[PDB]
Amino acid sequence: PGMDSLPNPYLQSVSLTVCYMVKIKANLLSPFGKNPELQVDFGTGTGQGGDIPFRFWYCDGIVVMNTLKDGSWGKEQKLHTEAFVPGQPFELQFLVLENEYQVFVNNKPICQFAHRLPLQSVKMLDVRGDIVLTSVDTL
Amino acid sequence: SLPNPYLQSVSLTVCYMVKIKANLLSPFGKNPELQVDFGTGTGQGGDIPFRFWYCDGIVVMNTLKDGSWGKEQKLHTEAFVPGQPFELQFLVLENEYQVFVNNKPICQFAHRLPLQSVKMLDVRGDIVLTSVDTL
């Protein structure tokens, strides 16, 4: 039952471009008394409560995506998906393009998020949740 | 630097990226050439779903199927500055390859043969090839 994994939360300084990929490989846990959550922040890396151009949040069949701008969360983009089967390992991909982030799970497109803050203002990638995180790669 | 030509077995997906970093040379007696094959890896004459070729301000893209090339997609670009390092990206999506040079969109190539049939990446030309990465 031993397996190598990365720290959780996982932090990585980044500079996004118009053709940029994040690939996360992880598996949802079975936490005591709650459904496991997954959360990925493309954040500005300022202080606490600093801007978050793009947060991706998943729990129990539901994806919520939003933007934190000057202490204010915006209008949620919310959807249902069956892509995350606990406790099957999954591959979660974010593709940063000029117009939007594109999200894939296990090579299938799940959803897209139009940029609300400039992608150039993202400085910090933050991956956390009730997960065993095995790898995070960027290109 | 890396061998030139460069070969790497690959398996593409609907969200797949190739990033090439190279210095374009200044050969006396010709204009420098750059060629990237997304090929089937099935012998010397096998199908090539996507060839990207660049020389002297012109990009040509095409597909080799059953021993003959298709109808070209040709266009002009100034993105390759002679003698300068460049970064060339290929993004493989469900519908097309998207090409970027130094973080700028250059051109797109709709799939003509299945991306799943590409098995071999081939990078060559009048270049110093410093890195090839995929994800």
Residue numbers in the entry:
A (entry chain A): -1 to 137
B (entry chain E): 3 to 137
What is the paper's account of this structure, in its own sentences?
First, we solved the crystal structure of LGALS-11 in apo form to 2.0 Å complexed with β-D-galactose at 2.4 Å. LGALS-11 forms a homodimer via hydrogen bonds between residues L9 and S11 of monomers (i), and is inferred to have two unique cell attachment sites (called LDV and RGD) for integrin binding (ii). The LGALS-11 crystal structure enabled the localisation of the precise residue variation in the dimer interface connecting β-strands of two monomers, the glycan-binding groove and the putative integrin-binding site. The residue substitution from a hydrophobic residue (leucine) in isoform 1 to a polar or charged residue (glutamine) in isoform 2 is likely to hinder dimer formation, and energetically favour contact with water rather than the complementary polar (serine) residue (S11) to form a homodimer. Through sedimentation velocity studies, we confirmed that the residue substitution in the dimer interface affects the homodimers and subsequent oligomerisation of LGALS-11. The c(s) distributions at concentrations of 0.10, 0.30 and 0.90 mg/ml showed that isoform 1 is represented by a tetramer at all concentrations tested (sedimentation coefficient: 4.0 S), whereas isoform 2 is in a monomer–dimer equilibrium (sedimentation coefficients: 1.64 S and 2.5 S, respectively). To verify the tetrameric organisation of isoform 1, we then mutated residues L9 and S11 to alanine, produced a recombinant dimerisation mutant (DI-m) protein and assessed the sedimentation velocity of this protein. This DI-m protein exists as a monomer–dimer equilibrium (sedimentation coefficients: 1.1 S (monomer) and 1.7 S (dimer), respectively), similar to isoform 2. In addition, we demonstrated that only the homotetrameric form of LGALS-11 inhibits H. contortus larval development, and causes direct damage to the surface of the L4, an indication of loss of viability and death. No anti-parasitic activity was detected for isoform 2 or the dimerisation interface (DI-m) or carbohydrate recognition (CRD-m) mutant, indicating that extended oligomerisation or lattice formation via self-dimerisation and glycan recognition properties is critical for the anti-parasitic effect.
